[PDB]
Amino acid sequence: GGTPEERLAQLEKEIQALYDAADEVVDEVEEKDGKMTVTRTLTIGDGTVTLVETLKIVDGAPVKDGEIEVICNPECEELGKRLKALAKEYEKAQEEVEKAK
Amino acid sequence: LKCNQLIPPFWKTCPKGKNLCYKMTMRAAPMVPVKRGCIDVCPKSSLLIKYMCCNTDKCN
C-alpha cells in the first residue's frame, strides 16, 4: 500500500465495487426503543446477500453494536468472511487517517 | 456550535462536550439523512453507512 489516505481510498473503491456489481440494491432502516437496524439486500444473479448492521442510539447518536451480519440463502460463509474482514480493515484505515490528522 | 437537526429547518445549540455536527446517510443515498445533529466524536463509516462531520454552524 501507499499512504493511510491512499489505503483508505482503495478500500472505498472495493466497497463501492461490491455494490456496483449487484444487479439490484434495496435498503431498509428500522428503529425501535433505541435499537436501530440497517439492512441492505443485494441481488446477485439468482441469489441474494443480506447485510445487517445494528446500532444502539445513545444520547440521540448512533453507536456501533456488534459486527456486520451477512446472510444468504446459499452459503455466504466465504463471502461473509471477506466482507467481515473488509469491514474491520475499513475501520482501521479510518482510524489511522484520523490519528494522523 | 449550532447543528442542523434531522427535522428541517430546526437546529440545536450543542451542549458542552459535543463540538461536532454530523450527518448519517446510507452509502448509496447521500441526500437522505438518517441521523443528523450534534455529536462528540465522529463515527467511523461502515460498509452500509457514511458519516460526515464538521465543526461550523449549520454545516451538516
Q: What's the helix and strand layout?
A:
The complex is a heterodimer of chains A (101) and B (60).
Chain A: H1 4-20, E1 24-32, E2 35-44, E3 47-58, E4 61-64, E5 69-71, H2 77-100
Antiparallel strand pairs in A: 1-2, 2-3, 3-4, 3-5
Chain B: E1 2-4, E2 11-13, E3 20-26, E4 29-39, E5 49-54
Antiparallel strand pairs in B: 1-2, 3-4, 3-5
Short description:
The complex is a heterodimer of chains A (101) and B (60). Chain A has 101 residues and is of the alpha+beta class. Chain A has two helices and five strands, in the order αβββββα.
Features:
heterodimer, A: 101 residues, Nuclear Transport Factor 2, Chain: A, 2 helices, globular, B: 60 residues, mainly beta, CD59, 5 strands, 0% helix, de novo protein/toxin, diffusion
Number of helices of chain A: 2
Q: Can you tell me the CATH class of chain A?
A: Alpha Beta
Over the alpha carbons, how many angstroms does the gyration radius of chain B reach? 11 Å
Element order, helices and strands of chain B?
EEEEE
N-end to C-end Cα span of chain A: 19 Å
| Number of DSSP-assigned strands of chain A | 5
Shape of chain B: globular
Main location (chain B): secreted
Disulfide bonds (chain B): 3-21, 14-38, 42-53, 54-59
Keywords (chain B): Cardiotoxin, Cytolysis, Disulfide bond, Hemolysis, Membrane, Secreted, Target cell membrane, Target membrane, Toxin
Subcellular location (chain B): Secreted; Target cell membrane
